[PDB]
Amino acid sequence: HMQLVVINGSPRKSGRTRILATFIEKEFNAKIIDLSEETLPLYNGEEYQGELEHVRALRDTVKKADAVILTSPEYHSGMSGALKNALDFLSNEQFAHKPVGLIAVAGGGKGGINALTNMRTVGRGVYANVIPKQLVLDPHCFDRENYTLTDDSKLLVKGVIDELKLYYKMHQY
Amino acid sequence: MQLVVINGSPRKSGRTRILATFIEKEFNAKIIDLSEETLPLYNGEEYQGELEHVRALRDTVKKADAVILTSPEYHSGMSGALKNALDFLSNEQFAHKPVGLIAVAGGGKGGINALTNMRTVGRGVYANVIPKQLVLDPHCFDRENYTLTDDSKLLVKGVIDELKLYYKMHQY
Ligand SMILES: Cc1cc2nc3c(=O)[nH]c(=O)nc-3n(C[C@H](O)[C@H](O)[C@H](O)COP(=O)(O)O)c2cc1C
Ligand SMILES: Cc1cc2nc3c(=O)[nH]c(=O)nc-3n(C[C@H](O)[C@H](O)[C@H](O)COP(=O)(O)O)c2cc1C
DSSP: OOOEEEEEOOOOTTOSHHHHHHHHHHHTTOEEEEGGGOOSOOOOOOGGGGGSHHHHHHHHHHHHOSEEEEEEEOBTTBOOHHHHHHHHTOOHHHHTTOEEEEEEEOOSTTTTHHHHHHHHHHHHHTTOEEEEEEEEEOGGGEETTTTEEOHHHHHHHHHHHHHHHHHHHHHHO | OOEEEEEOOOOTTOSHHHHHHHHHHHTTOEEEEGGGOOSOOOOOOGGGGGSHHHHHHHHHHHHOSEEEEEEEOBTTBOOHHHHHHHHTOOHHHHTTOEEEEEEEOOSTTTTHHHHHHHHHHHHHTTOEEEEEEEEEOGGGEEGGGTEEOHHHHHHHHHHHHHHHHHHHHHTO
């Protein structure tokens, strides 16, 4: 019932975040926005960008979503430049009161919380309802050799989606 | 005292460019003007490190004695254009470098979220982000004459003056 969109915030074609975003796509029947495809240009605020097929598709896909998972790697203690660039095309027109769940992909140690805070702050900036439950996945959460999440990491991801579904239900109610 | 200023707005007609070009001219700073769109989207691939503009970005920031980061506040964060540019950089160019933050906002309480994002990312590349920071709102610009107001020029000088003191301290 919930029309879920997942944004892959990593621009790296061979990166870890893409494993997570494609897991959500396949396992939860989510529409992926895969920033590793580089079909969205740098935002420059010019009118012609609003006519580009991929800018219109980004805006339409996020507006129509019942809920969004924003995934990002932590790059230098923030979300990716790629993800922020995509969000610069969007606004409260597509996000107002939309349930949003955040998942960051980190390099281990204490990485990921700075990206999650950046994402929560920007999320509130477009007036999304960023849910309480959030998640950081470290490299041990990934089997890169088989392009998958570990069983434990699939369960942690499901926990975010389950809460996001409860927030979707409340927004419908 | 080799100063670099990054214009974080990608908008050719934007306000932040007035501030960044003010600093370039008044304080003899080298500008990195992201409205030129000569830097592509970061993708981590090896070939990007051979691009002239990526090499220029890295060399310009590495050799700077001090850096002003300017950004507009876009959705309560620094611009995607500025964050994209920083994703090319690292502690290799920033470690212990004095860095001053100036955000350009739309009025009201805008600009602090951008400053916070820039300070957190700046520490993440191990810069010494100085205490003094600034937000300029639309009234700080005379856009018709492509200039800052005299009051705004004094505020910008205050940031530069503190950055020069931190530069001198780092010369230890
Ligand atoms: C430009 C860049 C900066 C990074 N900075 C951080 C960091 O601040 N915190 C962190 O936990 N990992 C950092 N990493 C490592 C990522 O967490 C790691 O690459 C992870 O797999 C997610 O990125 P990916 O989806 O592109 O693979 C950084 C990696 C890159 C490419
Ligand atoms: C995509 C976008 C989002 C913006 N979000 C914010 C915001 O969160 N806070 C704010 O103070 N102003 C916001 N503004 C207004 C900017 O502060 C204003 O455009 C200002 O002139 C700086 O941007 P510029 O240098 O591109 O002109 C936003 C503008 C754009 C284009």
